[PDB]
Design a protein around this ligand. Structure first.
Ligand SMILES: *[C@@H]1O[C@H](CO)[C@@H](O[C@@H]2O[C@H](CO)[C@@H](O[C@@H]3O[C@H](CO[C@H]4O[C@H](CO)[C@@H](O)[C@H](O)[C@@H]4O[C@@H]4O[C@H](CO)[C@@H](O[C@@H]5O[C@H](CO[C@]6(C(=O)O)C[C@H](O)[C@@H](NC(C)=O)[C@H]([C@H](O)[C@H](O)CO)O6)[C@H](O)[C@H](O)[C@H]5O)[C@H](O)[C@H]4NC(C)=O)[C@@H](O)[C@H](O[C@H]4O[C@H](CO)[C@@H](O)[C@H](O)[C@@H]4O[C@@H]4O[C@H](CO)[C@@H](O)[C@H](O)[C@H]4NC(C)=O)[C@@H]3O)[C@H](O)[C@H]2NC(C)=O)[C@H](O)[C@H]1NC(C)=O
Ligand SMILES: *[C@@H]1O[C@H](CO)[C@@H](O[C@@H]2O[C@H](CO)[C@@H](O[C@@H]3O[C@H](CO[C@H]4O[C@H](CO)[C@@H](O)[C@H](O)[C@@H]4O[C@@H]4O[C@H](CO)[C@@H](O)[C@H](O)[C@H]4NC(C)=O)[C@@H](O)[C@H](O[C@H]4O[C@H](CO)[C@@H](O)[C@H](O)[C@@H]4O[C@@H]4O[C@H](CO)[C@@H](O)[C@H](O)[C@H]4NC(C)=O)[C@@H]3O)[C@H](O)[C@H]2NC(C)=O)[C@H](O)[C@H]1NC(C)=O
Lengths: 208, 206
């Protein structure tokens, strides 16, 4: 026994557009089996609020339960670097655990987006890789997706943000397409959403 | 008390000059029983040559006991299991076993990619090394130029690919001036599936 608490930041895509709802999430896992009750206390910059909503206590799986408390947040507050403390109270837990999270406190830097064609070596394979390099951005809260002429593409993966040498972050997004589709005239785009970008959105095309 | 067992660093396993080490970490111990005895087992056989690190502590009620066992390079690549038996007096012993990923060994595919034409306006460009479809995750990636090693590069964490293999990217940063004078940069990769545990891919200007 002995429950652990994990606190999660709001999704970046949700941060960017006021049309979406950004949510900070406190997740309690591995809880007791005779105490199906936990109390959440949220604080914004040291001031308690009651915006929150606790999830039902389900299920285990393996043993125990996971309780999830979701407090949604204001778009501006997160970006302003407001602190969010999630005090989890359990009664099978000396002593109640507090977790704090916020935006990275530093100088915001706009990402440089570079689309990169498949290696001439990779041509021999049936599937080729379209690589989108995004570098020199801060903070790491960023969203990377791929699109085609009219519909978005999938089966692509994006690397975790990596701290660069100059103190900034970069990552890679690798889109996998059939080589037959590449040697045609198809146009692929790498769309990037970040707070430091103007209109919190940029896009780069990659064609043959 | 909870028991956590950690695998060696891939750079230490793939390099004969380094010492790969499995690490056993005990957390949530008391100041009523501040003493732990470790028992290490290689394929069911006990060994005695480990090393105990002294407690820290961890600034709570608890301490944090760490036992470290040096691992043979061939044993770890051959897939031998290492078990860390923790005995405490507030324990009705907890056993943790660890080894190399027991999956299908896949040879890495290495592709060097030139700077985007967009990046050329800048003073520093990016040389990119794509390494894909390798298994396990245990890999080592470094850059060299003209025979000498580069230092201004970063490598992403291995990423789990959709076909169950892994991939990562290694970004070398050079002055644009070096790139345009036709200097030749090579991307070095160390992995078990590779012949001689090594491959090399060069990237130059045209
Ligand atoms: C009281 O306080 C304490 C202290 O805070 C609390 O402790 C915490 O307890 C919790 C849980 O109770 C622990 O959680 C678990 O954490 C691990 C991952 O952790 C690590 O990163 C943490 C970062 O947050 C870090 O803090 C922590 O210390 C770990 O860090 C790693 O440490 C190792 C060991 O040293 C490093 O590796 C080794 O590295 C060295 C090199 O390192 C350096 C150095 O700096 O020292 C580098 C130097 O460069 C080098 N110097 C030189 C000259 O070379 C030196 C040098 O080597 C010498 O040291 C110096 O001479 O070394 C070597 O390379 C070694 O060879 C190498 O072995 C490593 O680098 C380092 N990493 C980092 C990033 O720092 C998780 O794995 C756990 O996850 C599992 O369990 C959960 C449930 O129990 C699951 O939900 C979860 O899914 C997960 O499951 C498991 O999944 C896997 C598959 O993925 C399965 O295989 C497994 O079976 C499965 N388990 C299951 C199902 O049960 C978990 O999150 C936490 O670690 C601990 N925190 C700390 C800090 O100790 C405590 O809780 C408190 N009490 C309370 C609250 O009551
Ligand atoms: C009983 O059964 C239970 C259910 O299986 C089981 O619960 C599990 O317990 C482990 C912890 O031991 C916990 O692991 C953490 O997982 C985090 C990611 O979880 C995401 O993703 C997982 C899948 O990967 C999902 O299962 C989760 O539900 C959750 O999903 C996300 O949820 C949100 C909201 O719903 C969505 O918006 C997301 O889209 C969605 N994402 C995905 C992919 O689905 C992971 O972040 C945790 O990692 C960090 O904390 C650890 C603390 O030890 C560190 O070890 C670790 O290094 C990470 O550290 C951070 O690293 C950063 C960068 O390095 C630093 O900047 C941070 O500072 C640092 N954090 C700090 C301060 O510590 C962690 O691995 C599982 O999530 C949890 N599973 C579930 C379903 O809840 C129990 O363990 C079982 N008990 C027993 C006894 O067996």
């Amino acid at each position: 026994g002995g429950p652990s608490v994990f606190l999660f930041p709001p999704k970046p895509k949700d941060t960017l557009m006021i049309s979406r709802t950004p949510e900070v999430t406190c997740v309690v896992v591995d809880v007791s089996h005779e105490d199906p009750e936990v109390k959440f206390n949220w604080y914004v910059d040291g001031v308690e609020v009651h915006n929150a909503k606790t999830k039902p206590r389900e299920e285990q799986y393996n043993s125990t339960y996971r309780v999830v408390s979701v407090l949604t947040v204001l778009h501006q507050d997160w970006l302003n670097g407001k602190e969010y403390k999630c005090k989890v109270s359990n009664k099978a837990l000396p002593a109640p655990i507090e977790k704090t999270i916020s935006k990275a406190k530093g100088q915001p830097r706009e990402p440089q987006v570079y689309t990169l064609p498949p290696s001439r070596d990779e041509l021999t394979k049936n599937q080729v890789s379209l690589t989108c390099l995004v570098k020199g951005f801060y903070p790491s809260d960023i969203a990377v997706e791929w699109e085609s002429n009219g519909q978005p593409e999938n089966n692509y993966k994006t690397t975790p943000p990596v701290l660069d040498s100059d103190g900034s972050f970069f990552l890679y997004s690798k889109l996998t397409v059939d080589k037959s589709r590449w040697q045609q005239g198809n146009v692929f785009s790498c769309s990037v959403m970040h707070e430091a970008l103007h209109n919190h959105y940029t896009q780069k095309s990659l064609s043959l």
